[PDB]
Amino acid sequence: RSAVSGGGRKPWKQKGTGRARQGTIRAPQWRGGGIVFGPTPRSYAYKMPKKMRRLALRSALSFKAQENGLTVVDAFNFEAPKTKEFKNVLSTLEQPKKVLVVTENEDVNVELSARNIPGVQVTTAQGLNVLDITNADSLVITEAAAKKVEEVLG
Amino acid sequence: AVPKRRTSKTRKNKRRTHFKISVPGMTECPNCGEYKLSHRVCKNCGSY
Amino acid sequence: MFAIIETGGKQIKVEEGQEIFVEKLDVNEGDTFTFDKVLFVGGDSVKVGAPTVEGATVTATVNKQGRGKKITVFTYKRRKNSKRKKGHRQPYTKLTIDKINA
Amino acid sequence: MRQTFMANESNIERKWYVIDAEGQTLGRLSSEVASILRGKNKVTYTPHVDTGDYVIVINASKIEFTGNKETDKVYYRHSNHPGGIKSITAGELRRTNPERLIENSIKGMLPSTRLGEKQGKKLFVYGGAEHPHAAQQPENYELRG
Amino acid sequence: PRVKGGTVTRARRKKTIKLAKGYFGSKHTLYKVAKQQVMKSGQYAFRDRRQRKRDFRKLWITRINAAARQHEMSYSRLMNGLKKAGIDINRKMLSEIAISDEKAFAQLVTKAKDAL
Amino acid sequence: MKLHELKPAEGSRKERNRVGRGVATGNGKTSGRGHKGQKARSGGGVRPG
Amino acid sequence: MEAKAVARTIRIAPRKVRLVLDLIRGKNAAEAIAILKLTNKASSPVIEKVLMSALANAEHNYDMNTDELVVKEAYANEGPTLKRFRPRAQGRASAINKRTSHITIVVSDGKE
RNA sequence: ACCGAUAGUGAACCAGUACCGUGAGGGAAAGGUGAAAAGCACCCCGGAAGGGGAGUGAAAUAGAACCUGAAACCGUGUGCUUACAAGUAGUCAGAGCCCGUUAAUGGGUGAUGGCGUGCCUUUUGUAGAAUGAACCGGCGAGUUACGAUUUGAUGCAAGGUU
RNA sequence: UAACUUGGGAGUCAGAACAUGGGUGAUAAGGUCCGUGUUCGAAAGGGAAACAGCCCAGACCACCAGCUAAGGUCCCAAAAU
RNA sequence: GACAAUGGUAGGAGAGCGUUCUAAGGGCGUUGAAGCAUGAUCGUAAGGACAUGUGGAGCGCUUAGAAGUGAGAAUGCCGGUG
């Protein structure tokens, strides 16, 4: 009511017209508006204890290990970015449609050669979260990233 | 002064059953023309 | 030629050949259900049961384990914000008398 | 809704009876006749159609009134006009129109529905022992105790 | 997100207008007056399922009483003596013997009559 | 888990009581307030103590 | 075969036009002209103009015998109204409904 | 995990604009042809509007009020009913007359019988002659933030937490 | 077969009639104010002609089964002229 | 398998049905989506289908999220229409 334009005028008088008691042209039963309890701009984020974040991330990639969706390889050696070549890498070793490649530090040529295939996501070992681990059907970590996620998660 | 109740669709149609209209005279003009009104002299499209 | 069987919690006036509707028995379809409680046999020779006729079964074949038509059970109170709506299909059996005894 | 005989047209046969009314008290005669008209002496009785048969009351001027209710027992009647209340004693109806004395006793023992008005149409009361209905062939009916 | 009142108000109101078929004029067209009549008629249907069991036992006794006075019996003395005989037949089955098989009703009258 | 087969822990989540929606919820007309008085108005009631 | 004509948004109100339109329906096409020429209602030159138009669509478009035709259907539907106001007393207007009609007559010879 | 044209800015539209007020000031309603305008050449009725053909188009009850077109309301047809009857308009019980289904101990109608004084809100108590609603449609009311306390759940625990 | 304690959440502080013990009034009130019950309130069903509070009796839902309570049994209108 | 319970207003507790949106999965659509209309279908309920018309592009389902989430009443508001 306080935000819609107009409506300071009481629209008619309180007694004696035969019509209902209305107080402004912009009351919430009027057509012109005034919303009662609608959306307000708020923030939806919240937090867990940070021992409960390590355990949720260990449980997301132990579910990958127990269902054999963990394929550790050696280093990716891409000089130039080439999406056609990286798609053949994911077919010589058999992978499902959604795959999550993980390197230790940021490899700029893997993150470009896999950027365009629908279903594939490149992630730093530092940048693993629960929602792209559990979105993928299979991990493909490297040697340097498997040792890195082992040190920081345990 | 004012109607205490609305009249229904049934009660309204029972009232206006005598709200009708009659067919008129319709006698032929034997000299020439179409049907004239009975006991009337024609003006147009007839010889009465 | 004429019998009164007792079945369910009530009594049925049966003749041989007709399709009768009884509250639900624990038989399957296509079976033969014999009625054990005959109270009155008439027709030509009239045998009045003492409470029963002491014998005199009625065999009948079973058709159509079924559910009845849905009735909606709606009851409300006049000013008090309290009503209840529920539905009901009642089970039945459609037997067919085919042989009488006395 | 298993099996109950519900009577019908092409299913009921209404016969004709004659009740001699000499030496009969009014509402004991009238109550027995009221259950012949409705059909409650029939085993094929349904309440919603007109089972029940015809009654002729043939004497009707020889009706007993016990007590003092031929000078008492005024019959009242209002004319739907202001102060239009009108009365006649039971003895004055016995000597003058005794047919309406009896056929208002019996029609008052009948329901006021559309069926009870047509069940009262089956009653033919005559003052003095001659009725015209020899074509309809009625029987004698003796009243029960 | 905003959810508007689309398509669920009619679907709830049409199946009350459809459930009110055969009512006088306004009471099968308009929602507010047919809703009240369907609530009224569900209350009547509950009530009259309980009274159909009363009004048919009332019908059977009237026919047993009229069939027993053709044998010089009352309804009261018939089913007194028919219980002293041990007969466990209904008012319904006894009302259907008396219409269909007139001799079989007369043979259980003379079993109740000598039971007194 | 999977993002299409994930389910919460048992007893963790209840749905909240929407109040003022129809007869059969038990909080429909008067909405848990009772009929009248200061406690039945919006913003009404009185301060603690 | 049937032949029809309509007249949409005729400023005569639907109640006033259905009076004279009840006089001519079911009747043959020759005498329906004579009824519409002799009733002194306002609608009688308008339905007659539509009955002329449907007898002309029978002879021309469908090649019927216009001498033996009968008016099957003769109805008038509601059209869009023109909502006018009217100043009565003490600053108080009242609405006047300028109703319109869709007049429709169809004509046939009853054969298929 | 904002709105979809009564929403979202008052304003999706030649809006602070018609309009109202002496003035400050108040203040609207009003989106949708089709892919493409190919937007109906000609013929007929008519003064014209309108129609009926023809024609375009996948579609013209897509014809410029033009996407779908719901109810109120207005009609025209009908199958069954109704002119001795007292009615909260049904509801059970039912003959008759029609009809044939998401085929199931079917559908429409109802001679007649039994029962039966709307719904809310208010009240000790309302058929109430107490209040509210002409009808239909849309809109229209326990929300959010922060804190507190309780449970529920889950961490790990003499520690737990940023 | 409950009771108690602790905790979360309440709604109510306008009651009514009968019967009974009382005050008040007028051994007046469908009055009023208390004690005591029951019912209504928030309880439909049956009876009291109709009739919140009286009488009988507490409705999970089908049944065209039976017995019964208060009440009743010539006709209306079930059952004893 | 026995046995027991199940009138109910303020009010307390529980379990649900639909609505729009999101996420993931799996789908359906000019061989006609959503709507709309009709039907004698199913579920204890809120409800769910199916068929056939109309309609001419979207929409289900599963699981889990979020809420502008459910109307018959306010001498409600705005539209139509008596």
PDB file of all heavy atoms in Angstrom, chain H residues 109-119:
ATOM      1  P     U H 109     -33.705 -35.972 -16.401  1.00  0.00           P
ATOM      2  OP1   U H 109     -33.449 -34.550 -16.095  1.00  0.00           O
ATOM      3  OP2   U H 109     -33.303 -37.010 -15.426  1.00  0.00           O
ATOM      4  O5'   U H 109     -35.257 -36.137 -16.681  1.00  0.00           O
ATOM      5  C5'   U H 109     -35.911 -35.321 -17.637  1.00  0.00           C
ATOM      6  C4'   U H 109     -37.267 -35.874 -17.964  1.00  0.00           C
ATOM      7  O4'   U H 109     -37.126 -37.221 -18.465  1.00  0.00           O
ATOM      8  C3'   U H 109     -38.190 -36.017 -16.775  1.00  0.00           C
ATOM      9  O3'   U H 109     -38.849 -34.807 -16.473  1.00  0.00           O
ATOM     10  C2'   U H 109     -39.131 -37.127 -17.208  1.00  0.00           C
ATOM     11  O2'   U H 109     -40.142 -36.608 -18.050  1.00  0.00           O
ATOM     12  C1'   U H 109     -38.213 -38.008 -18.048  1.00  0.00           C
ATOM     13  N1    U H 109     -37.700 -39.176 -17.309  1.00  0.00           N
ATOM     14  C2    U H 109     -38.513 -40.278 -17.216  1.00  0.00           C
ATOM     15  O2    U H 109     -39.624 -40.336 -17.702  1.00  0.00           O
ATOM     16  N3    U H 109     -37.985 -41.328 -16.531  1.00  0.00           N
ATOM     17  C4    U H 109     -36.752 -41.383 -15.938  1.00  0.00           C
ATOM     18  O4    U H 109     -36.417 -42.416 -15.371  1.00  0.00           O
ATOM     19  C5    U H 109     -35.961 -40.211 -16.082  1.00  0.00           C
ATOM     20  C6    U H 109     -36.453 -39.174 -16.750  1.00  0.00           C
ATOM     21  P     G H 110     -38.992 -34.329 -14.954  1.00  0.00           P
ATOM     22  OP1   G H 110     -39.481 -32.935 -14.962  1.00  0.00           O
ATOM     23  OP2   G H 110     -37.744 -34.668 -14.236  1.00  0.00           O
ATOM     24  O5'   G H 110     -40.155 -35.246 -14.391  1.00  0.00           O
ATOM     25  C5'   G H 110     -41.419 -35.266 -15.034  1.00  0.00           C
ATOM     26  C4'   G H 110     -42.224 -36.472 -14.635  1.00  0.00           C
ATOM     27  O4'   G H 110     -41.418 -37.664 -14.826  1.00  0.00           O
ATOM     28  C3'   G H 110     -42.672 -36.475 -13.181  1.00  0.00           C
ATOM     29  O3'   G H 110     -44.004 -36.951 -13.059  1.00  0.00           O
ATOM     30  C2'   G H 110     -41.713 -37.443 -12.509  1.00  0.00           C
ATOM     31  O2'   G H 110     -42.252 -38.114 -11.393  1.00  0.00           O
ATOM     32  C1'   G H 110     -41.380 -38.414 -13.635  1.00  0.00           C
ATOM     33  N9    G H 110     -40.039 -38.959 -13.473  1.00  0.00           N
ATOM     34  C8    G H 110     -38.878 -38.247 -13.555  1.00  0.00           C
ATOM     35  N7    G H 110     -37.822 -38.968 -13.328  1.00  0.00           N
ATOM     36  C5    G H 110     -38.326 -40.224 -13.066  1.00  0.00           C
ATOM     37  C6    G H 110     -37.652 -41.413 -12.743  1.00  0.00           C
ATOM     38  O6    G H 110     -36.438 -41.595 -12.635  1.00  0.00           O
ATOM     39  N1    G H 110     -38.524 -42.464 -12.558  1.00  0.00           N
ATOM     40  C2    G H 110     -39.877 -42.371 -12.667  1.00  0.00           C
ATOM     41  N2    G H 110     -40.548 -43.499 -12.434  1.00  0.00           N
ATOM     42  N3    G H 110     -40.533 -41.263 -12.950  1.00  0.00           N
ATOM     43  C4    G H 110     -39.693 -40.237 -13.144  1.00  0.00           C
ATOM     44  P     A H 111     -44.961 -36.258 -11.979  1.00  0.00           P
ATOM     45  OP1   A H 111     -45.317 -34.915 -12.487  1.00  0.00           O
ATOM     46  OP2   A H 111     -44.315 -36.382 -10.654  1.00  0.00           O
ATOM     47  O5'   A H 111     -46.268 -37.153 -11.987  1.00  0.00           O
ATOM     48  C5'   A H 111     -47.226 -37.025 -13.020  1.00  0.00           C
ATOM     49  C4'   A H 111     -48.270 -38.089 -12.884  1.00  0.00           C
ATOM     50  O4'   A H 111     -47.721 -39.347 -13.346  1.00  0.00           O
ATOM     51  C3'   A H 111     -48.689 -38.370 -11.455  1.00  0.00           C
ATOM     52  O3'   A H 111     -49.677 -37.478 -10.982  1.00  0.00           O
ATOM     53  C2'   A H 111     -49.142 -39.816 -11.517  1.00  0.00           C
ATOM     54  O2'   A H 111     -50.437 -39.901 -12.086  1.00  0.00           O
ATOM     55  C1'   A H 111     -48.146 -40.396 -12.513  1.00  0.00           C
ATOM     56  N9    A H 111     -46.960 -40.942 -11.842  1.00  0.00           N
ATOM     57  C8    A H 111     -45.791 -40.293 -11.556  1.00  0.00           C
ATOM     58  N7    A H 111     -44.910 -41.038 -10.951  1.00  0.00           N
ATOM     59  C5    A H 111     -45.549 -42.254 -10.849  1.00  0.00           C
ATOM     60  C6    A H 111     -45.143 -43.465 -10.309  1.00  0.00           C
ATOM     61  N6    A H 111     -43.947 -43.613  -9.759  1.00  0.00           N
ATOM     62  N1    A H 111     -45.999 -44.505 -10.350  1.00  0.00           N
ATOM     63  C2    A H 111     -47.198 -44.320 -10.909  1.00  0.00           C
ATOM     64  N3    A H 111     -47.693 -43.216 -11.457  1.00  0.00           N
ATOM     65  C4    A H 111     -46.809 -42.215 -11.387  1.00  0.00           C
ATOM     66  P     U H 112     -49.350 -36.529  -9.734  1.00  0.00           P
ATOM     67  OP1   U H 112     -50.537 -35.696  -9.443  1.00  0.00           O
ATOM     68  OP2   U H 112     -48.041 -35.890  -9.991  1.00  0.00           O
ATOM     69  O5'   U H 112     -49.166 -37.541  -8.525  1.00  0.00           O
ATOM     70  C5'   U H 112     -50.231 -38.383  -8.123  1.00  0.00           C
ATOM     71  C4'   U H 112     -49.721 -39.578  -7.372  1.00  0.00           C
ATOM     72  O4'   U H 112     -48.691 -40.239  -8.143  1.00  0.00           O
ATOM     73  C3'   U H 112     -49.047 -39.281  -6.052  1.00  0.00           C
ATOM     74  O3'   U H 112     -49.974 -39.054  -5.014  1.00  0.00           O
ATOM     75  C2'   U H 112     -48.185 -40.513  -5.840  1.00  0.00           C
ATOM     76  O2'   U H 112     -48.967 -41.585  -5.346  1.00  0.00           O
ATOM     77  C1'   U H 112     -47.765 -40.847  -7.272  1.00  0.00           C
ATOM     78  N1    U H 112     -46.406 -40.361  -7.588  1.00  0.00           N
ATOM     79  C2    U H 112     -45.355 -41.148  -7.187  1.00  0.00           C
ATOM     80  O2    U H 112     -45.493 -42.203  -6.602  1.00  0.00           O
ATOM     81  N3    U H 112     -44.118 -40.667  -7.494  1.00  0.00           N
ATOM     82  C4    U H 112     -43.835 -39.501  -8.150  1.00  0.00           C
ATOM     83  O4    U H 112     -42.662 -39.205  -8.355  1.00  0.00           O
ATOM     84  C5    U H 112     -44.974 -38.738  -8.536  1.00  0.00           C
ATOM     85  C6    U H 112     -46.196 -39.184  -8.250  1.00  0.00           C
ATOM     86  P     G H 113     -49.595 -38.072  -3.810  1.00  0.00           P
ATOM     87  OP1   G H 113     -50.848 -37.650  -3.145  1.00  0.00           O
ATOM     88  OP2   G H 113     -48.663 -37.053  -4.339  1.00  0.00           O
ATOM     89  O5'   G H 113     -48.787 -39.005  -2.811  1.00  0.00           O
ATOM     90  C5'   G H 113     -49.372 -40.198  -2.328  1.00  0.00           C
ATOM     91  C4'   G H 113     -48.351 -41.106  -1.696  1.00  0.00           C
ATOM     92  O4'   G H 113     -47.418 -41.588  -2.693  1.00  0.00           O
ATOM     93  C3'   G H 113     -47.462 -40.480  -0.646  1.00  0.00           C
ATOM     94  O3'   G H 113     -48.099 -40.348   0.604  1.00  0.00           O
ATOM     95  C2'   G H 113     -46.278 -41.426  -0.623  1.00  0.00           C
ATOM     96  O2'   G H 113     -46.603 -42.603   0.094  1.00  0.00           O
ATOM     97  C1'   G H 113     -46.154 -41.780  -2.100  1.00  0.00           C
ATOM     98  N9    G H 113     -45.186 -40.907  -2.773  1.00  0.00           N
ATOM     99  C8    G H 113     -45.461 -39.892  -3.641  1.00  0.00           C
ATOM    100  N7    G H 113     -44.389 -39.294  -4.069  1.00  0.00           N
ATOM    101  C5    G H 113     -43.356 -39.957  -3.434  1.00  0.00           C
ATOM    102  C6    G H 113     -41.968 -39.749  -3.502  1.00  0.00           C
ATOM    103  O6    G H 113     -41.353 -38.913  -4.163  1.00  0.00           O
ATOM    104  N1    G H 113     -41.267 -40.636  -2.708  1.00  0.00           N
ATOM    105  C2    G H 113     -41.845 -41.600  -1.937  1.00  0.00           C
ATOM    106  N2    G H 113     -40.998 -42.358  -1.239  1.00  0.00           N
ATOM    107  N3    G H 113     -43.143 -41.812  -1.860  1.00  0.00           N
ATOM    108  C4    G H 113     -43.831 -40.954  -2.629  1.00  0.00           C
ATOM    109  P     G H 114     -47.766 -39.077   1.519  1.00  0.00           P
ATOM    110  OP1   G H 114     -48.812 -38.935   2.554  1.00  0.00           O
ATOM    111  OP2   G H 114     -47.454 -37.956   0.611  1.00  0.00           O
ATOM    112  O5'   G H 114     -46.418 -39.485   2.248  1.00  0.00           O
ATOM    113  C5'   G H 114     -46.349 -40.679   3.004  1.00  0.00           C
ATOM    114  C4'   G H 114     -44.930 -40.987   3.388  1.00  0.00           C
ATOM    115  O4'   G H 114     -44.164 -41.332   2.210  1.00  0.00           O
ATOM    116  C3'   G H 114     -44.159 -39.839   4.000  1.00  0.00           C
ATOM    117  O3'   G H 114     -44.445 -39.659   5.371  1.00  0.00           O
ATOM    118  C2'   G H 114     -42.720 -40.231   3.732  1.00  0.00           C
ATOM    119  O2'   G H 114     -42.298 -41.214   4.661  1.00  0.00           O
ATOM    120  C1'   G H 114     -42.834 -40.892   2.362  1.00  0.00           C
ATOM    121  N9    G H 114     -42.518 -39.964   1.268  1.00  0.00           N
ATOM    122  C8    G H 114     -43.386 -39.489   0.327  1.00  0.00           C
ATOM    123  N7    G H 114     -42.823 -38.690  -0.531  1.00  0.00           N
ATOM    124  C5    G H 114     -41.504 -38.637  -0.126  1.00  0.00           C
ATOM    125  C6    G H 114     -40.411 -37.930  -0.670  1.00  0.00           C
ATOM    126  O6    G H 114     -40.382 -37.177  -1.646  1.00  0.00           O
ATOM    127  N1    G H 114     -39.259 -38.158   0.054  1.00  0.00           N
ATOM    128  C2    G H 114     -39.165 -38.963   1.150  1.00  0.00           C
ATOM    129  N2    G H 114     -37.954 -39.052   1.702  1.00  0.00           N
ATOM    130  N3    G H 114     -40.168 -39.630   1.664  1.00  0.00           N
ATOM    131  C4    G H 114     -41.301 -39.418   0.981  1.00  0.00           C
ATOM    132  P     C H 115     -44.496 -38.182   5.988  1.00  0.00           P
ATOM    133  OP1   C H 115     -44.916 -38.277   7.402  1.00  0.00           O
ATOM    134  OP2   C H 115     -45.240 -37.316   5.048  1.00  0.00           O
ATOM    135  O5'   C H 115     -42.979 -37.719   5.985  1.00  0.00           O
ATOM    136  C5'   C H 115     -42.033 -38.352   6.825  1.00  0.00           C
ATOM    137  C4'   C H 115     -40.632 -37.972   6.441  1.00  0.00           C
ATOM    138  O4'   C H 115     -40.413 -38.252   5.037  1.00  0.00           O
ATOM    139  C3'   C H 115     -40.301 -36.502   6.568  1.00  0.00           C
ATOM    140  O3'   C H 115     -40.005 -36.118   7.894  1.00  0.00           O
ATOM    141  C2'   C H 115     -39.129 -36.350   5.618  1.00  0.00           C
ATOM    142  O2'   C H 115     -37.940 -36.829   6.220  1.00  0.00           O
ATOM    143  C1'   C H 115     -39.517 -37.311   4.498  1.00  0.00           C
ATOM    144  N1    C H 115     -40.159 -36.627   3.354  1.00  0.00           N
ATOM    145  C2    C H 115     -39.378 -35.913   2.444  1.00  0.00           C
ATOM    146  O2    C H 115     -38.152 -35.846   2.580  1.00  0.00           O
ATOM    147  N3    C H 115     -39.965 -35.304   1.402  1.00  0.00           N
ATOM    148  C4    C H 115     -41.277 -35.377   1.249  1.00  0.00           C
ATOM    149  N4    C H 115     -41.810 -34.757   0.199  1.00  0.00           N
ATOM    150  C5    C H 115     -42.101 -36.094   2.148  1.00  0.00           C
ATOM    151  C6    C H 115     -41.504 -36.699   3.173  1.00  0.00           C
ATOM    152  P     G H 116     -40.499 -34.692   8.434  1.00  0.00           P
ATOM    153  OP1   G H 116     -40.126 -34.591   9.862  1.00  0.00           O
ATOM    154  OP2   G H 116     -41.914 -34.526   8.033  1.00  0.00           O
ATOM    155  O5'   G H 116     -39.624 -33.649   7.612  1.00  0.00           O
ATOM    156  C5'   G H 116     -38.230 -33.540   7.843  1.00  0.00           C
ATOM    157  C4'   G H 116     -37.546 -32.767   6.745  1.00  0.00           C
ATOM    158  O4'   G H 116     -37.809 -33.389   5.465  1.00  0.00           O
ATOM    159  C3'   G H 116     -38.007 -31.338   6.554  1.00  0.00           C
ATOM    160  O3'   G H 116     -37.422 -30.452   7.484  1.00  0.00           O
ATOM    161  C2'   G H 116     -37.610 -31.057   5.116  1.00  0.00           C
ATOM    162  O2'   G H 116     -36.222 -30.795   5.028  1.00  0.00           O
ATOM    163  C1'   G H 116     -37.882 -32.405   4.461  1.00  0.00           C
ATOM    164  N9    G H 116     -39.221 -32.445   3.865  1.00  0.00           N
ATOM    165  C8    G H 116     -40.368 -32.939   4.416  1.00  0.00           C
ATOM    166  N7    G H 116     -41.398 -32.814   3.630  1.00  0.00           N
ATOM    167  C5    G H 116     -40.886 -32.200   2.503  1.00  0.00           C
ATOM    168  C6    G H 116     -41.523 -31.804   1.311  1.00  0.00           C
ATOM    169  O6    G H 116     -42.708 -31.930   1.004  1.00  0.00           O
ATOM    170  N1    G H 116     -40.639 -31.217   0.424  1.00  0.00           N
ATOM    171  C2    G H 116     -39.309 -31.030   0.661  1.00  0.00           C
ATOM    172  N2    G H 116     -38.618 -30.442  -0.319  1.00  0.00           N
ATOM    173  N3    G H 116     -38.697 -31.391   1.770  1.00  0.00           N
ATOM    174  C4    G H 116     -39.546 -31.964   2.635  1.00  0.00           C
ATOM    175  P     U H 117     -38.310 -29.295   8.145  1.00  0.00           P
ATOM    176  OP1   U H 117     -38.250 -29.428   9.615  1.00  0.00           O
ATOM    177  OP2   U H 117     -39.617 -29.289   7.454  1.00  0.00           O
ATOM    178  O5'   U H 117     -37.552 -27.959   7.742  1.00  0.00           O
ATOM    179  C5'   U H 117     -37.431 -27.581   6.385  1.00  0.00           C
ATOM    180  C4'   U H 117     -37.592 -26.098   6.230  1.00  0.00           C
ATOM    181  O4'   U H 117     -38.777 -25.675   6.935  1.00  0.00           O
ATOM    182  C3'   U H 117     -36.485 -25.253   6.828  1.00  0.00           C
ATOM    183  O3'   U H 117     -35.389 -25.118   5.947  1.00  0.00           O
ATOM    184  C2'   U H 117     -37.177 -23.929   7.106  1.00  0.00           C
ATOM    185  O2'   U H 117     -37.214 -23.136   5.933  1.00  0.00           O
ATOM    186  C1'   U H 117     -38.602 -24.372   7.429  1.00  0.00           C
ATOM    187  N1    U H 117     -38.906 -24.352   8.872  1.00  0.00           N
ATOM    188  C2    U H 117     -39.474 -23.192   9.338  1.00  0.00           C
ATOM    189  O2    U H 117     -39.708 -22.244   8.623  1.00  0.00           O
ATOM    190  N3    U H 117     -39.772 -23.178  10.665  1.00  0.00           N
ATOM    191  C4    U H 117     -39.550 -24.194  11.557  1.00  0.00           C
ATOM    192  O4    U H 117     -39.866 -24.029  12.729  1.00  0.00           O
ATOM    193  C5    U H 117     -38.958 -25.366  11.000  1.00  0.00           C
ATOM    194  C6    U H 117     -38.663 -25.409   9.703  1.00  0.00           C
ATOM    195  P     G H 118     -33.947 -25.676   6.353  1.00  0.00           P
ATOM    196  OP1   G H 118     -33.994 -27.150   6.252  1.00  0.00           O
ATOM    197  OP2   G H 118     -33.523 -25.039   7.618  1.00  0.00           O
ATOM    198  O5'   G H 118     -33.000 -25.146   5.190  1.00  0.00           O
ATOM    199  C5'   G H 118     -33.272 -23.918   4.534  1.00  0.00           C
ATOM    200  C4'   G H 118     -32.243 -23.640   3.473  1.00  0.00           C
ATOM    201  O4'   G H 118     -32.616 -22.485   2.687  1.00  0.00           O
ATOM    202  C3'   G H 118     -30.856 -23.302   3.974  1.00  0.00           C
ATOM    203  O3'   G H 118     -30.128 -24.449   4.353  1.00  0.00           O
ATOM    204  C2'   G H 118     -30.248 -22.573   2.791  1.00  0.00           C
ATOM    205  O2'   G H 118     -29.791 -23.499   1.820  1.00  0.00           O
ATOM    206  C1'   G H 118     -31.455 -21.837   2.218  1.00  0.00           C
ATOM    207  N9    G H 118     -31.491 -20.418   2.606  1.00  0.00           N
ATOM    208  C8    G H 118     -32.453 -19.804   3.357  1.00  0.00           C
ATOM    209  N7    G H 118     -32.232 -18.535   3.534  1.00  0.00           N
ATOM    210  C5    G H 118     -31.056 -18.296   2.850  1.00  0.00           C
ATOM    211  C6    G H 118     -30.331 -17.099   2.690  1.00  0.00           C
ATOM    212  O6    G H 118     -30.589 -15.981   3.130  1.00  0.00           O
ATOM    213  N1    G H 118     -29.194 -17.282   1.928  1.00  0.00           N
ATOM    214  C2    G H 118     -28.811 -18.472   1.390  1.00  0.00           C
ATOM    215  N2    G H 118     -27.679 -18.455   0.684  1.00  0.00           N
ATOM    216  N3    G H 118     -29.478 -19.597   1.528  1.00  0.00           N
ATOM    217  C4    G H 118     -30.584 -19.444   2.273  1.00  0.00           C
ATOM    218  P     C H 119     -29.109 -24.379   5.585  1.00  0.00           P
ATOM    219  OP1   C H 119     -28.565 -25.733   5.816  1.00  0.00           O
ATOM    220  OP2   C H 119     -29.774 -23.659   6.691  1.00  0.00           O
ATOM    221  O5'   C H 119     -27.917 -23.485   5.036  1.00  0.00           O
ATOM    222  C5'   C H 119     -27.086 -23.954   3.988  1.00  0.00           C
ATOM    223  C4'   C H 119     -26.119 -22.891   3.553  1.00  0.00           C
ATOM    224  O4'   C H 119     -26.840 -21.762   3.003  1.00  0.00           O
ATOM    225  C3'   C H 119     -25.291 -22.286   4.664  1.00  0.00           C
ATOM    226  O3'   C H 119     -24.188 -23.095   5.005  1.00  0.00           O
ATOM    227  C2'   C H 119     -24.908 -20.929   4.097  1.00  0.00           C
ATOM    228  O2'   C H 119     -23.817 -21.055   3.202  1.00  0.00           O
ATOM    229  C1'   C H 119     -26.153 -20.567   3.290  1.00  0.00           C
ATOM    230  N1    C H 119     -27.061 -19.665   4.032  1.00  0.00           N
ATOM    231  C2    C H 119     -26.800 -18.296   4.052  1.00  0.00           C
ATOM    232  O2    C H 119     -25.820 -17.849   3.448  1.00  0.00           O
ATOM    233  N3    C H 119     -27.624 -17.474   4.724  1.00  0.00           N
ATOM    234  C4    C H 119     -28.669 -17.968   5.371  1.00  0.00           C
ATOM    235  N4    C H 119     -29.454 -17.115   6.018  1.00  0.00           N
ATOM    236  C5    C H 119     -28.971 -19.352   5.370  1.00  0.00           C
ATOM    237  C6    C H 119     -28.150 -20.149   4.694  1.00  0.00           C
TER     238        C H 119
END
